[PDB]
Design a binder for these strands. Sequence first.
RNA 1: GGGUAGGUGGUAAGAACCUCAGAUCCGGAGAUUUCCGAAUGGAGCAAUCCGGUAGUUGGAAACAGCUAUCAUUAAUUGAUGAAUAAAUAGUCAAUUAAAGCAAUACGUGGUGAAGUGAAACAUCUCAGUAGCCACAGGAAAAGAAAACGAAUGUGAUUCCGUGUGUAGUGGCGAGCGAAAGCGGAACAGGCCAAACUUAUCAUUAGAUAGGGGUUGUAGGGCUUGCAAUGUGGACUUGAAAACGAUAGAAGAAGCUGUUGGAAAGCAGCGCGCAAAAGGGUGAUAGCCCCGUAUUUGAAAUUGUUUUCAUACCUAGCGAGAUCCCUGAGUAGCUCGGAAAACGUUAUUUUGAGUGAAUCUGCCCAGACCAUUGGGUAAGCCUAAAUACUAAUUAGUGACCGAUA
RNA 2: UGAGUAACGCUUGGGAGUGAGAAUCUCCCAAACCGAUUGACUAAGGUUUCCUGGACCAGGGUCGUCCUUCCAGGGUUAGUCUGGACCUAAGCUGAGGCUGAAAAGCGUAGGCGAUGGACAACAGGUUAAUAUUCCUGUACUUACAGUUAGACUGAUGGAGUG
Lengths: 110, 111, 64, 95, 204
Amino acid sequence: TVAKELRQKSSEELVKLVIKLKGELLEYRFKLAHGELDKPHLINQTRRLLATILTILTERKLNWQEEQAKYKLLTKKTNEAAVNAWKQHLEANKAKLLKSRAKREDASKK
Amino acid sequence: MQRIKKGDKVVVITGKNKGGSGIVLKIMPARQQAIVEGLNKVTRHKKKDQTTKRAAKQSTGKVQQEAPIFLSKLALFDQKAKQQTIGKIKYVMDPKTNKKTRVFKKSNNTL
Amino acid sequence: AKKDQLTLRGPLYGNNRSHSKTITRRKWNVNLQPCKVKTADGKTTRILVSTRTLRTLKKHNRLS
Amino acid sequence: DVTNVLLKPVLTEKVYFNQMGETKKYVFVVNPKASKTRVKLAFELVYGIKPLKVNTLIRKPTTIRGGSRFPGLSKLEKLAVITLPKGIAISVTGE
Amino acid sequence: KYTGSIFKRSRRLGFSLLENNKEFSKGKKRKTIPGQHGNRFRSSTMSGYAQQLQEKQRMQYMYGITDKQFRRLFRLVLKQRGNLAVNLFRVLESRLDNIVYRMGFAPTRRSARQLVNHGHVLLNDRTVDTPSIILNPGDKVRLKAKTIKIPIVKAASESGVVSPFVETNNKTFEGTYVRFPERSELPAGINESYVVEWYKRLVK
RNA sequence: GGGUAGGUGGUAAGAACCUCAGAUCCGGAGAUUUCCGAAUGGAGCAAUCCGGUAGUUGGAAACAGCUAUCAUUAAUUGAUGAAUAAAUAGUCAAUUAAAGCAAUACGUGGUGAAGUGAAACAUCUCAGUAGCCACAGGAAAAGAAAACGAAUGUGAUUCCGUGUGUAGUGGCGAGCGAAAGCGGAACAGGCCAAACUUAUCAUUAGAUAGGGGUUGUAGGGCUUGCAAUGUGGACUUGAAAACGAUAGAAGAAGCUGUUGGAAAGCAGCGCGCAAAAGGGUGAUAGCCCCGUAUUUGAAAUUGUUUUCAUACCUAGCGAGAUCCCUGAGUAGCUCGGAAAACGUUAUUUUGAGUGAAUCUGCCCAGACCAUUGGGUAAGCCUAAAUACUAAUUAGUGACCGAUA
RNA sequence: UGAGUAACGCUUGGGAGUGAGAAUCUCCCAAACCGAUUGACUAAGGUUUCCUGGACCAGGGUCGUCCUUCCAGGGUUAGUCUGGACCUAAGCUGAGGCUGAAAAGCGUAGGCGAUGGACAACAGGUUAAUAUUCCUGUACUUACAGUUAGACUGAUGGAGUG
Ligand SMILES: [Mg+2]
Ligand SMILES: [Mg+2]
Ligand SMILES: [Mg+2]
Ligand SMILES: [Mg+2]
Ligand SMILES: [Mg+2]
Ligand SMILES: [Mg+2]
Ligand SMILES: [Mg+2]
Ligand SMILES: [Mg+2]
Ligand SMILES: [Mg+2]
Ligand SMILES: [Mg+2]
Ligand SMILES: [Mg+2]
Ligand SMILES: [Mg+2]
Ligand SMILES: [Mg+2]
Ligand SMILES: [Mg+2]
Ligand SMILES: [Mg+2]
Ligand SMILES: [Mg+2]
Ligand SMILES: [Mg+2]
Ligand SMILES: [Mg+2]
Ligand SMILES: [Mg+2]
Ligand SMILES: [Mg+2]
Ligand SMILES: [Mg+2]
Ligand SMILES: [Mg+2]
Ligand SMILES: [Mg+2]
Ligand SMILES: [Mg+2]
Ligand SMILES: [Mg+2]
Ligand SMILES: [Mg+2]
Ligand SMILES: [Mg+2]
Ligand SMILES: [Mg+2]
Ligand SMILES: [Mg+2]
Ligand SMILES: [Mg+2]
Ligand SMILES: [Mg+2]
Ligand SMILES: [Mg+2]
Ligand SMILES: [Mg+2]
Ligand SMILES: [Mg+2]
């Protein structure tokens, strides 16, 4: 039943499905470990659907990791705060580094 | 197929309860019993336990429920016949739908 | 092992009968004596063989 | 890459003690066969902020429910202690 | 037990004794072996009996028999009244599959035997699975209806072809007989009676 | 494919879902199959550690992901190549196989004791048993007479009964114990070497690849004719059919009253049977239920048999020549052992030595010789009957019933 | 049965509290022993015996509200510490190879093998339980890339040191 619907789908759409379900599976497991998962059966349905998707992808001699490595799309949104924190950290590091060398140099000069 | 399904009227032919008509609410095939409403009323002595949000109250006194009964003691009840009687069933297959249908053997009533 | 390289004939285990018919297990070993022959362009290669095989090589013109 | 090396976050007294005061420290449980570099890469590809450093704990299996009719052993855990830079605090739940 | 190197030893000699015995040239003879063995015969000078042996072989093959079974049947027929040269012919022809092949519902005698063993065959005062039962001159052999349910039918035609010592009506599947096969219906493939004397010497 | 109306494995209730677009469940065929383990990239204290190479994706690189591959031995082929010209040793690469395990069981071979008995003990027995090791197979081994053996004889091997505890063999003590013959189970006999001939190898072939041949009342080759186109295999590919195996479908016949918590017991009146095997149902049910007898059914995988065709083998009786071939460190013999029932001996085998002949030939018939007769060693393969059950299905028990 | 007998395996008094029950549990004050040790840090071994809360089936040679016992939860953070990614000693393994009825034994090249050699971090603070590991402060070492200046770079081998 379900295998027919996925069989109708092409290969590229299937690898998109696997990444989305992998991500969703991680979220369900994290929410369950934090006690915020009202529906505890969705873990099995994603895993079974994930296992089913693997079966259709392995009929043809195609993998799921290599096929997604050839073409993919990058990430976004998780950039602004990251660079703010990183810029602050390197600035603090450079201030300590510059201060330390100065103290040593003038001490050796004296 | 099966002699007793979920929903059809059924009666008891042996035991303390004789001629007890009821509706099968659930069938356990593995242990061969059957829950029939209104029959085999048992009264568990409901204690009090408080360890959950619902268990904080868990109001349970003399709740009367249903005890399972062996399927051998059950017998199908006839409804189509003008004079209802208790009999045995066949497993004829009508070519109209090619589906197996239960038919009594002391009459010609389907199911 | 103490065996020929041309054939596979090896030692022979038997009994050591003496006066009073006392039984003691003994071993007859074959006379493995070095021998050189000419095979594959006459290439001599020393091969430990039984004197019996040595006589066979000599009569078969092989031993030259 | 496959992201099976991030099994479950854990919240204890030690975790909440670290998870306050500027730099936050989040403690997860990871694949016992995974390495520190794999942990950093998994965190990069699924959260987006580079860990400052990673520490690892191995908790040995031990006997549990001793004396009960059927005794059982524990389960092998590898713990990872990520520490994000100053001023950044992301939520473990909600994406 | 080391680098035996058959090349090293074989070439080491190139003839020798072990070399030639093993000489890989060793072919297959995998067709020479079978056929010649298969089955032979002819007559010789010193024992005479050669004729008896060859004739015995032919007769057994005509009906697909093992020599042991033949010795049993000869023992059975031997004791009775007298010059029973009319009895053992009926005994050899009373085989159920033999009657099935002369009845005409099988292309060949062994194929008929296969049918019999597969449970096609219905008798009178009994039924039948074993393809060796000795039938009585006047006996019926009603054929199953399941076999006809598998119309290959080609058979029924052979049935009518028949041989006079068999009376079978085609399609209707039924058979019996009387006036057991005379020697005419037992053709010159094997028509001699000193095979009887061969078994008298070999079987008491 | 079957099959339904339930299911989410047990100690197990509850929560939350799935399921009539046909779920769970059963059967056939597939997919995935972490690490250790013959373990085989290297190591190692098992389930751990450390990598190389060729790709591909991020990085500015180190590096990090994702793939495939990387042990040893043997055989074949190719390349390279020492002492030392050539050539080999050696080195490298490619392809194909081998490794290991278990069925507390059967087979073969090698090795091989002792407790014990002899009322002690050494010959002997135990016993070629236990054990150790190697190689398998679905069985293995054996196998087509240089035989038995005393006759107007039988005509591969194997297994069973008898011959018989007989002939014999034994510090002639303890003991051991056949081979003929007869009655049975099954039955099958095949193929090379050499002659002769063909083609090719610096044709010094003495080698390679073909035709010819497979024996004992001798066979085959040489030359010359007649009759033959078949019958049969231990047989290859296919096609068709039948019988099964791995899920299943249908499958008859009872009410009343009494004791009783409860009837199926008991009693009355009936009914069915190709079903009166069994299990459950509140006691002891042919007719309450599941089943059983019987009739049936397979998409897929697999087993046996049959039919047809098709490769590959397979063929008789004469004449003349008087020529050639028929398995050599072999059979014998000597010196030490052994196998056979035999404690070594006619027969079989072998560690050391020696060593023949070629159908008017050689071996055998319990030392040996002659006559008579039997048989063709020193080359190979061989189904069946025979040995066993860890496992799958069905079933049985004057077998056990928690110290068995 | 012996028999409620032998034995209970080196350490005192009191006040307050908990508790249904206290010589035995908690706190306080003393008291008595150790003090080249019954003190503190670790190797080996042990393998959760560590911390918190609860319980008093069983174990504790008595008792117990208590325990190293049981239940539930939690606890072990390394570029610099101890060992691998570095090296070898005794010894082990060991392709070829030698020897040996078989199994196997010996052994070369290689490879393992610390109890040794080489190698960069110290002070303080913090939790009930971890700290040269977490935090603060101040450092050091080894790789890779870009860049500036100078310089010809110089090993799988030789030598010195080690
Ligand atoms: Mg002895
Ligand atoms: Mg660590
Ligand atoms: Mg289906
Ligand atoms: Mg003795
Ligand atoms: Mg004695
Ligand atoms: Mg004695
Ligand atoms: Mg064999
Ligand atoms: Mg059938
Ligand atoms: Mg049915
Ligand atoms: Mg029925
Ligand atoms: Mg019954
Ligand atoms: Mg002789
Ligand atoms: Mg002997
Ligand atoms: Mg002769
Ligand atoms: Mg000969
Ligand atoms: Mg027991
Ligand atoms: Mg007991
Ligand atoms: Mg006592
Ligand atoms: Mg007492
Ligand atoms: Mg006393
Ligand atoms: Mg006293
Ligand atoms: Mg006392
Ligand atoms: Mg004490
Ligand atoms: Mg005291
Ligand atoms: Mg003191
Ligand atoms: Mg101390
Ligand atoms: Mg414990
Ligand atoms: Mg504590
Ligand atoms: Mg406590
Ligand atoms: Mg106590
Ligand atoms: Mg640090
Ligand atoms: Mg090392
Ligand atoms: Mg050390
Ligand atoms: Mg501490």
